[PDB]
């Protein structure tokens, strides 16, 4: 049974899962759109929106809290620079997941996840 257990383990030990989520979040902040598996993107969304919300408080404390998750200074600088001003005054829902197709090697369901405010065509 897994009644009301609300996060995906993603076939990994806990430390590996946390490291993978951190790497994905840095990649998504640096390049505004990434291509992944659907399950990984759905897990990343829950991981990464609180981190983007934390930029609404422009403080050293919030910067340090965000760095404790990221551990990447380039990603932190970009996030508290351009990404913050872009996602300012948006009440949640900063990301979007769209399904694309299937891989050749293992038939994995593929998608892209992107920051919403960097897709001008979708507004």
**Residue numbers at the binding site for RNA (CB under 7 A):** 1-11, 13-15, 18-19, 37-40, 42, 45-46, 49-50, 53, 56, 60-62, 64-65, 67-68, 71, 73, 90-98, 106, 108-109, 116, 122
Residues forming beta bridges with residue 112, ordered by sequence position:
35, 98
Q: Which residues of 100-116 are buried (b: 16+ CB within 10 A; e: fewer)?
A: eeeeeeeeeebbebbbe
Minimum Å gap between C-beta 2 and other proteins is 10
Contacts of residue 7, Cβ cutoff 8 Å, sequence gap at least 6: 43, 46
Beta carbon nearer to other proteins, 60 or 121: 121
Asked whether position 56 contacts other proteins by CB under 8 A, the answer is: no
Q: What is the dihedral of CA 58, 64, 68, 69, to 10 degrees?
A: 10
Among 1, 14, 15, 104, the residue binding other proteins under the rule CB under 8 A is 1
Beta carbon nearer to RNA, 58 or 68: 68
Please give the residues from 77 up to 116 whose contact with other proteins meets the rule CB under 8 A. 98-101, 112
55 closest CA partner among 93, 25, 21, 83: 83
Minimum Å gap between C-beta 84 and RNA is 13
């Amino acid at each position: 049974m897994r009644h009301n257990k609300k996060f995906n383990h993603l076939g990994r030990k806990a430390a590996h899962r946390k490291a993978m989520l951190s790497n994905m979040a840095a990649s998504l902040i640096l390049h505004k759109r990434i291509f992944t598996t659907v399950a990984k993107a759905k897990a990343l969304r829950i991981y990464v929106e609180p981190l983007l919300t934390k930029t609404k408080e422009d403080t050293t404390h919030s910067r340090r809290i965000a760095f404790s998750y990221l551990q990447n200074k380039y990603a932190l600088k970009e996030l508290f620079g351009d990404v913050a001003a872009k996602i300012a005054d948006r009440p949640g829902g900063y990301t979007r997941i769209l399904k694309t197709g299937y891989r050749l090697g293992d038939n994995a369901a593929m998608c892209f996840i992107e920051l919403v405010d960097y897709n001008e065509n979708m507004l």
